[PDB]
Amino acid sequence: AMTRKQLINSMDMMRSACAPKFKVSTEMLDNLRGGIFAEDRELKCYTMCIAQMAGTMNKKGEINVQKTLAQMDAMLPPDMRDKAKEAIHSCRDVQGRYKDSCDKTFYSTKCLAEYDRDVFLFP
Ligand code: NA
Protein backbone atom coordinates (compact mmCIF):
# COMPACT_ATOMS: atom_id res chain seq x y z
CA ALA A 1 0.00 0.00 0.00
CA MET A 2 0.86 3.68 -0.18
CA THR A 3 3.43 5.60 1.87
CA ARG A 4 2.08 8.57 3.90
CA LYS A 5 3.27 10.93 1.06
CA GLN A 6 1.45 8.81 -1.57
CA LEU A 7 -1.72 8.80 0.57
CA ILE A 8 -1.60 12.64 0.94
CA ASN A 9 -1.15 13.09 -2.87
CA SER A 10 -4.14 10.78 -3.52
CA MET A 11 -6.34 12.62 -0.94
CA ASP A 12 -5.34 16.00 -2.47
CA MET A 13 -6.60 14.74 -5.90
CA MET A 14 -9.85 13.55 -4.27
CA ARG A 15 -10.29 17.02 -2.66
CA SER A 16 -9.71 18.83 -6.00
CA ALA A 17 -12.36 16.58 -7.69
CA CYS A 18 -15.08 17.02 -5.03
CA ALA A 19 -14.47 20.49 -3.41
CA PRO A 20 -15.55 22.51 -6.52
CA LYS A 21 -19.09 20.95 -6.28
CA PHE A 22 -19.71 22.43 -2.80
CA LYS A 23 -19.67 25.90 -1.17
CA VAL A 24 -16.79 24.96 1.19
CA SER A 25 -13.76 27.09 2.10
CA THR A 26 -10.06 26.20 2.67
CA GLU A 27 -10.64 26.79 6.41
CA MET A 28 -13.48 24.20 6.45
CA LEU A 29 -11.56 21.68 4.27
CA ASP A 30 -8.21 22.04 6.05
CA ASN A 31 -9.94 21.84 9.46
CA LEU A 32 -11.80 18.67 8.35
CA ARG A 33 -8.53 17.01 7.26
CA GLY A 34 -7.37 17.93 10.82
CA GLY A 35 -10.41 16.26 12.48
CA ILE A 36 -12.47 19.47 13.08
CA PHE A 37 -16.02 19.15 11.69
CA ALA A 38 -17.89 22.37 10.83
CA GLU A 39 -21.70 21.88 10.98
CA ASP A 40 -22.22 23.05 7.39
CA ARG A 41 -24.49 21.18 4.98
CA GLU A 42 -22.13 21.75 2.00
CA LEU A 43 -19.25 20.26 4.01
CA LYS A 44 -21.48 17.28 4.99
CA CYS A 45 -22.25 16.57 1.31
CA TYR A 46 -18.55 17.09 0.42
CA THR A 47 -17.82 14.11 2.75
CA MET A 48 -20.38 12.08 0.74
CA CYS A 49 -18.61 13.04 -2.55
CA ILE A 50 -15.28 11.90 -1.06
CA ALA A 51 -16.83 8.63 0.31
CA GLN A 52 -18.21 7.90 -3.22
CA MET A 53 -14.87 8.68 -4.98
CA ALA A 54 -13.00 6.52 -2.37
CA GLY A 55 -15.14 3.41 -3.26
CA THR A 56 -16.79 3.23 0.20
CA MET A 57 -20.50 3.70 -0.72
CA ASN A 58 -23.34 1.59 -2.13
CA LYS A 59 -25.92 2.87 -4.63
CA LYS A 60 -28.56 3.24 -1.83
CA GLY A 61 -26.41 6.13 -0.38
CA GLU A 62 -25.07 4.06 2.55
CA ILE A 63 -21.50 3.20 3.53
CA ASN A 64 -20.45 -0.33 2.46
CA VAL A 65 -18.33 -1.39 5.48
CA GLN A 66 -16.92 -4.50 3.78
CA LYS A 67 -15.77 -2.48 0.74
CA THR A 68 -14.38 0.25 3.07
CA LEU A 69 -12.27 -2.34 5.00
CA ALA A 70 -10.91 -3.65 1.63
CA GLN A 71 -9.99 -0.10 0.46
CA MET A 72 -8.19 0.54 3.79
CA ASP A 73 -6.13 -2.72 3.26
CA ALA A 74 -5.26 -1.56 -0.34
CA MET A 75 -4.64 2.18 0.20
CA LEU A 76 -3.46 2.97 3.76
CA PRO A 77 0.09 2.85 5.11
CA PRO A 78 0.32 -0.25 7.32
CA ASP A 79 0.87 2.09 10.38
CA MET A 80 -2.72 3.56 9.84
CA ARG A 81 -4.53 0.56 8.26
CA ASP A 82 -5.31 -1.55 11.42
CA LYS A 83 -6.39 1.44 13.56
CA ALA A 84 -8.60 2.76 10.68
CA LYS A 85 -10.23 -0.69 10.32
CA GLU A 86 -10.92 -0.96 14.10
CA ALA A 87 -12.41 2.56 13.97
CA ILE A 88 -14.73 1.60 11.03
CA HIS A 89 -15.89 -1.47 12.98
CA SER A 90 -16.57 0.60 16.16
CA CYS A 91 -18.43 3.29 14.13
CA ARG A 92 -20.60 0.90 11.99
CA ASP A 93 -23.90 1.68 13.89
CA VAL A 94 -23.59 5.48 13.31
CA GLN A 95 -25.01 5.69 9.73
CA GLY A 96 -28.23 3.81 10.69
CA ARG A 97 -29.13 6.80 12.96
CA TYR A 98 -29.42 9.26 10.01
CA LYS A 99 -31.88 9.19 7.08
CA ASP A 100 -29.83 11.60 4.94
CA SER A 101 -26.72 10.24 3.17
CA CYS A 102 -24.58 13.40 3.74
CA ASP A 103 -25.38 13.06 7.47
CA LYS A 104 -24.47 9.33 7.26
CA THR A 105 -21.01 10.02 5.76
CA PHE A 106 -20.30 13.14 7.83
CA TYR A 107 -21.18 11.61 11.25
CA SER A 108 -19.53 8.25 10.39
CA THR A 109 -16.34 10.20 9.48
CA LYS A 110 -16.58 12.25 12.74
CA CYS A 111 -16.82 8.93 14.67
CA LEU A 112 -13.61 7.77 12.92
CA ALA A 113 -11.84 10.99 13.90
CA GLU A 114 -13.02 10.76 17.52
CA TYR A 115 -11.82 7.12 17.69
CA ASP A 116 -8.20 8.27 17.28
CA ARG A 117 -7.39 11.86 16.23
CA ASP A 118 -3.67 11.09 15.79
CA VAL A 119 -4.20 8.63 12.94
CA PHE A 120 -7.26 10.35 11.35
CA LEU A 121 -6.91 12.10 8.02
CA PHE A 122 -9.55 13.16 5.55
CA PRO A 123 -9.16 14.29 1.96
NA1 NA B 1 -8.29 -0.26 17.77
Side-chain angles (χ1 to χ4, degrees), residues 82-83 86-87 115:
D82 298 309
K83 287 176 182 191
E86 289 178 17
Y115 188 95

Side-chain angles (χ1 to χ4, degrees), residues 66-111:
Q66 282 307 139
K67 181 139 175 14
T68 300
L69 293 173
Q71 287 290 162
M72 290 182 164
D73 284 340
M75 295 297 99
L76 290 184
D79 59 15
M80 289 170 74
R81 175 196 65 216
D82 298 309
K83 287 176 182 191
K85 291 170 60 183
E86 289 178 17
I88 285 291
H89 188 256
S90 73
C91 293
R92 67 193 188 280
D93 291 326
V94 166
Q95 62 169 339
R97 305 172 169 139
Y98 296 96
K99 189 181 171 76
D100 175 275
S101 295
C102 300
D103 284 334
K104 290 182 187 287
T105 60
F106 176 91
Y107 295 117
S108 297
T109 299
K110 186 175 182 182
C111 182

Side-chain angles (χ1 to χ4, degrees), residues 10-44:
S10 174
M11 290 197 290
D12 286 345
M13 308 188 302
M14 309 187 59
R15 179 181 296 184
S16 70
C18 281
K21 300 171 179 293
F22 302 95
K23 292 179 174 50
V24 290
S25 67
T26 59
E27 169 187 277
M28 291 170 162
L29 292 162
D30 290 332
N31 280 358
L32 174 57
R33 175 164 302 179
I36 297 170
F37 288 74
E39 278 282 349
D40 176 289
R41 172 82 184 158
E42 296 286 305
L43 192 66
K44 296 186 160 180

